[model samples]
Each structure stands twice: as structure tokens, then as C-alpha cells.
Target: VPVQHPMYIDGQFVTWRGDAWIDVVNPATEAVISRIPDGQAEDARKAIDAAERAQPEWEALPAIERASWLRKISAGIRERASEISALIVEEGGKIQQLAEVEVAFTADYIDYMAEWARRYEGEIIQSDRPGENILLFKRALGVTTGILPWNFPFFLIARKMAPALLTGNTIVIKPSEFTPNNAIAFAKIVDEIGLPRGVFNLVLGRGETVGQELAGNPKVAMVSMTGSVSAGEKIMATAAKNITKVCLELGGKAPAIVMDDADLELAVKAIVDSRVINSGQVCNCAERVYVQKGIYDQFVNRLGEAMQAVQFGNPAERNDIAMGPLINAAALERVEQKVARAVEEGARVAFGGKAVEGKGYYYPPTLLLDVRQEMSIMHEETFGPVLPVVAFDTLEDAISMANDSDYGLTSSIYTQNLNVAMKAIKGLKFGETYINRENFEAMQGFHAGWRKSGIGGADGKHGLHEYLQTQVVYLQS
Candidate 1:
């Protein structure tokens, strides 16, 4: 089937002004699935202008009314959940179940943020002066530019757009050049569900042109991006030109700590599941796992077995395909190279190490054992389905090893000891700490990183605050 293409801008599907085109490929089949109009700076600026013009109207709507609109969109999304899921799978190469979960999560996020429209509150402070009153409230930051990454496109869009629109800010979303179709189709949903024209616009293009334009545009009040740490740094530099507010959820080399007292089976299952989820394309996937020496061998054995059992095949089959292909050839090659380097540096591949035969962009669910803190995989965010295990002798050692990485996004502690877990949770520098289980998939919790992992949080009421600025109003009685 010839895939349909569109560049959503100014409340319409428009053609790009540039000659560049990005071929959207199905990672399951390794074939060109469709093409997106690779927009240029002019196209991005047009979208930005439209957003700027529409900002005031969106802001002027009462918070309650705004919440109503957001809720309506959430309802609409629920109605078309299946179709959206199918589109996500078709365009993004995630398995059908995972794609469905992403769509469902998007709707959940919208609903969560919708309630915040009216629930978003501020405070009034008492003044010492008799006749003075201090009133503080949250205010929208006008037009926001959301640059979404390829993995979890709809989920990331929802993370940014729901808060932006609900808080009275208009938006111009730029989806990844490789996976623009889902965003384009999502824009259709926004328009169909009565999101005002110019309130929600999408521009499809490369980061150099369209993304850079949006980030550097003077009129754009804020720019939020979910991508690589390097990409976030560049966006930060670009947005700095206009002194625009920027929020980033970048890459991570998250550590999964399995203590001696933890259930070996549960710990191994969690690590394996997290490592292979989204083909380990997730920014917060457990890249470095630290197992206590007591149960290290058992954990390693079980994890390896789990990886070997993971089925990698067609994403559309909708079976127990635990791991799917990476997004593209580039992504697959990067994974291969990283695993090879790790193995060469004395790390042993516990299970998978190379690409599956004749499969599209499919790399096996790999596990690396005897990983040291100095290895590249240990220090860098692999961002692939490669789990590297490191054994620690003591609790302090495990904590130190987990905190050694520059990226402190998320960490997991598998332990039944409450005091031990609490100590690790308080000491760990990560933005989130998962305890005893793997529930990092929740959309309502705070998700961000410390250090290079991210600059701000997403997926909660706190996330809504990222799109807003505070204003204090003083009055004389």
C-alpha cells in the first residue's frame, strides 16, 4: 500500500516549501512505508506565526471552559483509540499491543491534564502591610514548540500538548522526521474534536531546518523536546538565542539494582521486561543493572533465559512478541556497534548480540555480563535492547555504582527491606525511583532526570507547570 502523507500546519494538511523528503519505513518489513514532506524554516515559521496569533484567544477562554475542551478531546480519542493504535503500529514499528498501550496512555494523559485546567491553582500570601494583598497565579507562556521523538510519538505529544493547551498556550508540534505519519493523523483527531485552528499545529521536518527554526524563533515562548541528550543540548543553544523557556526529557543510562534479599525471579523478570520494552528505545530503560553478589548468578541466568525467550517478529501479528525492531537501519547499526564494543571490552553477551536473520531492523534481546563502570555502555545511554549487568558486594557499593553514571534519569531497586529501599531512594540522585516492581509505565507520575537525564518533569500536574509561568499581582485595598 502507498502510504498517505501530509504536513499539518495552520489547522490544515499542507505541502512543504522545501524539496527534501523523508521516507517513512516500516521497521518490521524494512520497506519504505510512506513519505513525509520535509518542511523548511519557512514552514516552521508559518506554524509559529499561526500559534502566536491564536495564543490570546486560547488563553482568554475560562479555565473551566478550557478543561471542557480538553476533556472532549480525550473522549474523542477514546472513541478512536483502536484506529490510532493501528496507525502508531503501522508507522512506528512497535508491536500492536504496545502501540495500543501508547494510544491508551495518551488518552489517559489528556484526561489527567484536563482535570488540572480548573484544578491548577496558585496561592495568596499574607502581607505585613495593612492595605497590601499579594496574589500569585499560574499564567500560560503563549506559543510553545514541542519537538517529539520517534519512539512513543503519541505519548510524548500528549505529554507536551495536553499541558500546553490546557494551560492556555498554543502549540506547533514537530514530530520526528522518521515517524511523522502518526502525528499527522493525530492532528486530524485534534481538528475533528474541536481544538481551535492554530491552537494545535504540526510541522514535519528535519531538526536542522524546521526544528531549529522553531527553537530559535523569537515569538515562541517555550520549547519542550524529548530526544537525545545531544539533540537537547543543541535545542537548548538554539532556544537560548530568543531567551525562550525550554524543557527537555533527554537520554539516560538508568540503573536497575537487585539487592540480595529481593526475589530473584521477580527482579530478573523486571529487568528483562524493562530492557526489551520498546526494543530498549526508551530513554529510561534499565541500561545498567547492578545485582548483589549473593544472587547475581541466579539473576543473570534468569535474565538471559528471558531474553532468549523474547519473540521478535512482525509487529502486526499481535502475539507475545516481547521485542520488536529498532526504529531504522541506523538505530539497528548503532545497537550492534555498541554491543560489539562492549563485548570487545571484556563484557560477555549473556544471550543476544547480533541482528536476527532476515528480520527487519531486528536485533536480539541482548544481555551483557561483567560490565564495569568504565565501559562505554555503562557510561553512555545505549538506548537499545541491551541489558548490561554489574555485580556489587554491598548496599553502599550498589548505590555508588548506580549513581556513578552521568545520566540520572530513573533507577529501580528490587528489595523487600523497607529501610534499605528508603535509604537507596533518598540517596539516589535520579528523578524517579521504582521500588520492588516495574511500574515506570504509569502516565500520572513525575518522570524526569537529574543531571544529563533531563531538565524538567513530565506526565503529571507538575508537568503542567512546565508550560506555565508564575505572575504575582499586588493590589492596595
Candidate 2:
């Protein structure tokens, strides 16, 4: 059957209300996978209007009622997990395994938000003056725009959608143009779940078109972005005109620090999980490795063997491929330039320094030695399959090096010593820290970023709070 992709105003099934269409590509094969609507500002305006009209009813229903819808939506997503995962693999260049995980995580995250929806309660404070009473209520901020990136389309959608819907705020989402097919498919699941009309809409287009309008639109009460720092900054600047609130999960230059007394076996395992997962495309992926002088050589050699052993190929062929292609040709070239600059600045390749040959935008799992903090790969986020190693003499030294970045989304330390690990935990400036293990953000835990990494965070109860605003009231009794 030929696919009919369109802009989902009330839901993904809604007919296109806008003009042109955009091509969606398969990164591995460089094939034009599908054509979707080139969503525009007019469509966004419609979504905003629908959401505003629906907000009062959606919010007026008891929170428990909203929670039921969210839970059903979570089940709906899981029922179509395999199909949705395959689409994600095709559109986003995700390996079959990680793609499946993203699907499962997205469902669980929705359910978690449902749990929070029922548990959410406002405070009743005692009034000190006369016969007055003070009360605080948490209400969904009106229409929220989730400006998501291509890396994990469905998962990020659930992150934004579950909270906004359950908290009474309707959402207008603009997923990355590169991965709109899966995002639209996600909206299809919401539609299947019978969310109120206009309570959820998915718009597809370039950030400059749909995104700019949503950010500056006075009706859009809150905007949540998970993308590059430049994009977040521009969105914030535009939103500021209306004094709209923004939750930004921008960029990361994550570091994995291995101390002299650490477990080298676990160190290599953690490195593979953090960096090799998603071809090191994760925002919290370990981009830099800082090793204590005592175990520096041992780790360098061990990591080299592991990096070389990684199988690089398309996810369509097999289940064992360790890594997939970069999101596009531009990403491959950007990494190429970064690697070349690192080498010229006196860094050496421990293994697999070049891109793989063939039809895909593939870069082999790479490891860089003789790296210093001054290099771009060390300071700036490479956002690909590149891991740079630098040595440190003590815990103090390792912490200093790890903290040296404009981005501090996540940092890790592998240590057998509790004192050193504790010190590193306190010293590192990143928002989240991992100790003695690789990193993955859990649904119930806070996943935040520091400095240029982000302005706010997601996941857990705190994440739900991001979608809400407080209203304090004083009544004379």
C-alpha cells in the first residue's frame, strides 16, 4: 500500500491543512524513504487554536481521568512496538536493538507520567493573619510546543506528550524534519488512544518554518527543546519576546573518568555502553575519557581492542551490528573534520580512525590517544563515534579535566575507592554523574544538564513539574 503522510492537526490521521511536502530519507541506504508534509506556520496556528479550545475541558476533567487516557496511550504504543520500532530504524538510522529499547522506554515513560498524574496534589497552607486560608494549585501551562531532535523521536515525544496531556496542557509538537515519519506514527498512536481532538497535534517541517512560529506565538505558554545549543538559544531569544517559558535540554560534552585504582574490566564495559550505544550519538554519550596516570596505558590498549572489534553495518542486515550510520552526510563530514583537526593538534588514533566505505554515511567505532583538553574533540561534543583519551595524575586532576567544558550534561567516574568517587561526584560540574558503571537515564530519575548543557531537565516528578505552573490563592474563611 502506498503511504499517505500528512500533518496531524487533531491527530496524525487528519488531512493536510498546509501547502507543500518534504522528503524523508533512510540514512543507511541514502534512500528517499517517504515524503511527508512540509508543515508551515499556518498549521501550527491551527494546532495552537485547537489546543487552546480543548485545554479547559481536558484540564477540567479530574486528573485521574487524564491519567487513564495516558495509561491507555502507553498500552497503545506498546501494542504497536515492533512496527513503530521498524519505522524508527528506517527513518532515524537506529540499530534494531536500540530502536526496540526506545519503543519500550517510551511506553514505560508514559505510564510513569500516568502514575504522577494521579499522585499530583496541591498544597493547603495555614494563614497567619486573621481567618484567612492559603492554597496552592498546580495547573498545566496552556499550549506547550515540544521541539524535539531526530535522535530519539518517539521516546522524546512520550517525554513531552505524557506530561502535558496528563497535566491538562495540550501539546503541539514539531519533531525533527529528518525523522518525521516515526514522529507522525507516534502521533497516530495518540490518535488511536482517543485523546481529545486538538489535545495532541504533530506538525512536520523545518525548524525555521514551523519551529520559529511556535516559539514566538503568544498562545504557546511553554516550549521544550532538546537539540543543539544554537537552536535552543535562538528559540529562547524568540520566546523571550512574549516572555514565554522554555525548558531546554541542549548539548553535552560528556566525560568518563577512570581512576588508577579502578576496575579496568568494568571501565571498558562502561565505555562501550556509553559511547558505542547509538554509535555514540547520545547527548550523554561519553565523548572524552580521562584516565589516571597509573592505569592510563592499560585502559588505552584495552579500549583499542574493544573499539576495533565493533561491527559496523546497516541495521537492516543483521542483529549484531554494533553501530549504525551517522544521521546524514553532513554529520559524517562534520565528524571527519573534527577527527582531522584532533590529529593535527598532536592527537593519535588508537584504532579505527576513518569512515567505513559503501553506500551509507558510516564512521567506524573510533578511539583517539595522546588527546589533550585543548582539542575540539575533547571540549566540544563530537556527537559521533569518536572517543578521546587524556591522562590525569590524581582525582583532583581528573575532576578538573572533566569539568572543563561549556557543556556538562553528564559525567562518569569508574573507581574502586569510595573517597575518590565521592570527591569526583562533588567536584564534577555536570548535571548527572555515573559511578562504577555506564550511564542510562531511568524514567523515574531526573535527567538534567548543567551550564550550556541545558536550562531545565526531564524525567521523574521534577520533569512533570516543568509542564506546570503554580497558582497561589488566599481566601477568607
Candidate 3:
């Protein structure tokens, strides 16, 4: 089916200010499925102005009423699950089942965020003075600018949009240039669900134009970004000009540790799943795997066998496809270069290393062993289907190795020893820690990064709080 492409603003579809448009290609087929206009500064200004004007009325509505709107949107999403899932596969370069999971998780986030709006309350402090009362209430930010990444387009949009809308904040979204189709389609769902005009706006353009303008605009009260560390740095600098509140989810070199007591069979399965899921394009996927020296050889053998078992083909296929193409040609090249460098640095390539010969930009799932801390792949965020394994002897050595990098996004420890796991958790500097698990279960836990990984959290009531400010009111008798 031919797709429709246009920027969504003020609850309606609109063309770009510029005459030029970019093609949205299907990575699996390498064909142009749709074309979306590249927005200019004027387009950004219009969306910002609409959000600023709509904020007061939206915020004035009762929280429960606002929550109802989000619930309705979720219902709309559920009704059109198949259409959304297909778009995910076409635009996201993920397998059909994985794309469906993304849609379902997005729906789950909608329901979770809806409850936050209805039940959110503030504290009543105790005051010594008689007849003097202190009330602290949550106030919605005036306008929010959500800059979503390409890897998980719809899911990240829902992550930002759900909380922002439920807390009564109007938003202007700028999706990745590579994957704006899903964001545009999702905006249509909002319109169909009866969200107020100007509640959600989407603008498409390169990062330098629309993104920088939105971050620098004084009218935007908050800026939320999920992208590379370099992009986050630029956004931070731009937003700082207006002193706007910024929430960032940046890059990571997360480690998955397996101790001597760990269930090797379960650990191997989970690590393989985490590494290859979403083509290993996730920010918090297992970039580095650390196994105790005693079990390193066995782990490598099993992991290699599992990697060989992953089926690679067109994303539309019904098989359990473990790996697919990178988001684009540039991503493909980056993975190739990283793998090549790792080999040159003396790391052993235990499995696939090069791109597959076919139409799609497919790279086989790669596994590297004897990866030292000094290697670039060890410290860098290799956002692809590549896993680097290292061996450690002591628990302290493992924790130190994991914490040595600048990123503190997500870390996991696979161990049956409760005491050792707890110690590792306490010692690690990451924002989220998984005990005997690799990735987070959708809707159950909040996801965020510490240190350079990111600045704010997402997926919980705390995530909702990121979009809200506190107001104090005093009543005197």
C-alpha cells in the first residue's frame, strides 16, 4: 500500500514551508515507500506558537479529563494495531514480530501514563503557624519539545508524548529524519481519538534546523531528546541558551555480567536475545558481555552457536528472525568499521563479521572475544548487532570494568549468588540494574541512564514528574 506523508501540526496535516521533500525508504526492500517534507524554521515557529497558545486551556482541564483523552488514544492505537505494526517493519527495519511487540508496548505505556494523570497528587506539609496551610500541586510545563530517535520511533514517541499529554502539556515532536513516517502516522491516531487541536504537533527537518530552533526557543519550556551523545551535547548547549529544562536519553556501552554461579544456559539465551534484539540498535542493549574467566570459553561456544542460529532475511518473513539491517547505509558502514577495528586490535571474531550480500542493508550478528578495556569498541557505544565479550576473575574487577566507561545507562548481572549480585548492584554506577535479567520488561520498570548516559528517567510515575513542575500555595485565615 502507498503511504501518505506530511507533517502533523495543530491537529491537522500540513505541507512543509520548503518545496523540498525527502524519501522514506523501506530498509528491507530498499525502496521509497513515501516522501515527507523537510520543515524550515517557520514551520517550527508555528508549532511552538500553537503549543504556547494551547497550554493554558489544556492545563486548566481537570487531570482526569486529560487522562481520558490519553486512554482514548490508546484505544485507537489498539484498534489499528496491524497497520501500525506493518509500518514499524517497513520503516524501522525490524522483524514483523518485534515490530508488533513495539506497538503493543506503546499501548501499554499509554495505559500506564493514563493512571499517572488521574492519581497524581502533591504533599501537604506540616506548618507550626496556626490556620496557615501549605499545599504543593503539580503544574504542567507550558510547552514541551520531544526529539525522538530513529531506532524505536513509535515507542519513544509514546514514551515522551504519553506523559507530556497526560500531565496537560502540549508538545512539538521532531522525529529522526530517517524515520518520520511512524511519527506522522501516530499523530493521525491522536487526531482520530479526539485530542484537542494544538495538543500534539510534528515537524520534520534535519537536526540543525528544526531541532536546534526548538531547543533554543524561549517559548519551549522543556526539551526531551533521545539520541546520540553528540546530539545530546548539542541540544544541551542550544537549550541552555534559553535555560530551558532538558531531559536526555543518550548513548550507552552497557555491560551484561555473568558470574560463576550463574545459570549458564539461561544467561546465554538472555544475552543472545538482548544483543540481537532490534538488530542491536537499542541504546541500552548489551554492548559488552563480561563472563567469569572460569566460564568464558563455554559461554563463547554457546553464544557463537546461538548467533549462527539467528535467521536473517526480509523483515516481512514469519520466521524468528534474530537480526535485520541497520537503520540505513551510514549505520551499516559504522558497524563494519567498528568490527574491522576490533579485529585489528587482536580481539577474536568468533562468528559473523561482515554484511550479508542482498538487497537490504543486513549485517550478520557478530561476536568478539578477548576484548580488552583499551579497545575502542569496549568504551564506545556500538549501536549495532555486535557483541564484545571480556573475561574477569574477581567480582570487584568485574564491577570496576563495567563502571570504567563514561556511560551509565543500564547494566545487568547474571548470578545465582544473591549476596554477590547485591554487592555488584550497589557498586555499579548505572541508572538501572537487572538482577539475573538482561533487558527490562515493558510497562513494569522505569528506564533511564546515569552520568553521561542521560539526565532524566522514562516509563514510570517519575517520568511523568519530569514534565511537571511543583507550585506552592499558602492559605491564611
lDDT of 3: 0.86
Question: Each candidate's lDDT (Cα)?
Answer: 0.84, 0.86, 0.86
Cα lDDT tens digits, model 2, 143-243, are 89999999888899988888888899999999898888778777777777778898888877889989998899999999999999989999999999999
Show the lowest summed lDDT stretch of 10 residues, model 3: 437-446
All-Cα superposition RMSD per candidate: 1.5, 1.4, 1.5
Sequence-dependent TM-score of model 2: 0.97
Question: lDDT tens string, model 1, 342-421?
Answer: 99999987787977667578887887888887898888777668888888898898899889877878888988998998
Residue 358: error of model 2 in Å?
A: 3.3
> What would the TM-score be for candidate 1 when compared with the true structure?
0.97
Q: What TM-score, over all chains together, does every model reach?
A: 0.97, 0.97, 0.97
Give the per-residue lDDT digits (tens) of candidate 3, residues 380-474: 88877899999999999999999998899888899988789779979999888877776754564667788898888787877888988999988
* Position 179, candidate 1: lDDT: 79
Candidate 2 wrong stretches, greater than 4 Å:
1-4, 17-19
Query: Native-vs-model 1 lDDT?
Result: 0.84
